[PDB]
Design a protein around this nucleic acid. Sequence first.
RNA 1: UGGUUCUAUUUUCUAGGACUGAUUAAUAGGGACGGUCGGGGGCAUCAGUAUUCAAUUGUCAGAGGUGAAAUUCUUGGAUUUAUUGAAGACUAACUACUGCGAAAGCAUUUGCCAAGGACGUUUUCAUUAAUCAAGAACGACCAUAAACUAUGCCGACUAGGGAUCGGGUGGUGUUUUUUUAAUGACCCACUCGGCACCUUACGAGAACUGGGGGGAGUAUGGUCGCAAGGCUGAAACUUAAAGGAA
Lengths: 127, 102, 134
Amino acid sequence: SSVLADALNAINNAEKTGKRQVLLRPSSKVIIKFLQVMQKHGYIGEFEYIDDHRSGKIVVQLNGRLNKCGVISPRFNVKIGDIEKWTANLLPARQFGYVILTTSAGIMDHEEARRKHVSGKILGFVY
Amino acid sequence: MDFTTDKLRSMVRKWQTLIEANVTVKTSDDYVLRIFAIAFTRKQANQVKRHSYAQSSHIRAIRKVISEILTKEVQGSTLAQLTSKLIPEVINKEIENATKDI
Amino acid sequence: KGISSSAIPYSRNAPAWFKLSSESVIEQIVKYARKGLTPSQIGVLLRDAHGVTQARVITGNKIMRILKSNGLAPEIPEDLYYLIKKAVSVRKHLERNRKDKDAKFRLILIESRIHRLARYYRTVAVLPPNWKYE
RNA sequence: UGGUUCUAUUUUCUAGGACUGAUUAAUAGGGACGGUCGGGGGCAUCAGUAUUCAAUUGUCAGAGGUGAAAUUCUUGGAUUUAUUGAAGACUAACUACUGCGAAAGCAUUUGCCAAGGACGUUUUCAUUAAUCAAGAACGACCAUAAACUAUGCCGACUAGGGAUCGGGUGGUGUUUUUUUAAUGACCCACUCGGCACCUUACGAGAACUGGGGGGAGUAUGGUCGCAAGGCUGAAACUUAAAGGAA
């Protein structure tokens, strides 16, 4: 499996089982930015990067507000004009959740990406 | 010499191991004897697990010392000396004392 | 599959009781290698008796780099060499007695494992291409 | 390894020159080491008592076998008993919701040959990795059985609980014991890995080949079949003997 996918799988089903903390290993910059944007929108609480010298561990604390993480496995390019279409086709509803993209300006959600007018490849979603 | 069958059927119980050995030894006369041995793995007092099995290397080591010390009890006996030795069951006490280390 | 490996400490320093020299360790390393031990054996002897924890920490670099920079390079990597000699030991067992179908099966497994990392080492070109396992 | 020449006391010490230059170290993977572990395999060896057969006694009329019998053996002594030999198998009880093996499978001892797993590791290499269509390995003589009542909700999934097998660490009591080597057994806690068992919480879990259409019945002016009569002999013959029936 991937390295973002099993971290998001742990952070998904741990919250489904109703835990208040996940430990996810290993940890990359893209995982830090994904948890960064989802705590910017308020889906997880704090999280902490314990640096062992191998790859890093994250302890996320998460309350109740998430209900699905994911990754879109072909990292196809989206456009600023088709951000609205891709959110319509993969989100649950109209203003429900965020598609998260790797852009020129880094990892951002879809509405921040179209706010500062930059497209990029898709990464994953959260709602 | 031979046991009755009811004695060793009365000795065999499950949840233990029987270590049995045999050696073909020539005495201080020129009688050659096939002499056997049976032993059953006890459980200690305060043992709470129900098994008391030997770990089969303890079986090989116990069977080794059984063979060595009873082939030391023969060759160091004649037939009359060996018979007077195994009437009061004292080769069994030699095996027990030599094997309680294992 | 079991989890039984070694747990490298978080420290990357000499342990502050290691009063030996960073060069006398290298001299002991090349002495043991020239008297003929594989690098894993150098590491375990150095760890057990002359208490360097690990020599990538205490010396500069790892000990196969120390041996290659001091002139004691291996003909073939240690993994491939040990798997090669295990495969040829099983092959001589099989020529001795030819009803050991289980040992034939383990020879197929060992030969597959030979080809895997021989392919890896060949594409890295540690060892030259056109290398065959005889 | 070779060669040139510079300083002060017959031999002391000296200076120079020609044959490397990115990270970790995955509760990913491999390899080494260590004490081990197992009814894993191969070869050799050893033993056991049955069975079958044979030899020798002892004694005499039956012995098998069956629901009863019978084929069979038997006064040229069967069966039973005792001593001994030979053969081919097999490894009883110990034997387990235990172990090992990739599966089929594997149970006597001892030795050799290689192998394997788990654990321990402040050893080593450094991405060498995961899945499977294809393909490969294992699976003229003496003649043989397999299934046959069964079960369960699946996975990418949380925690446990008791018991057990292999390793390790710690404790500090009893069996052990001593100046010959090392080495146990049990109790307890922790921990890793297994064969199972008893529970829990939470998820879309979608996108050796050939097949008609439910279960239980009912009817049939259709089609294809099979089937009745009536004493036999005995019909062209009112017909014998004998038999049947009552």
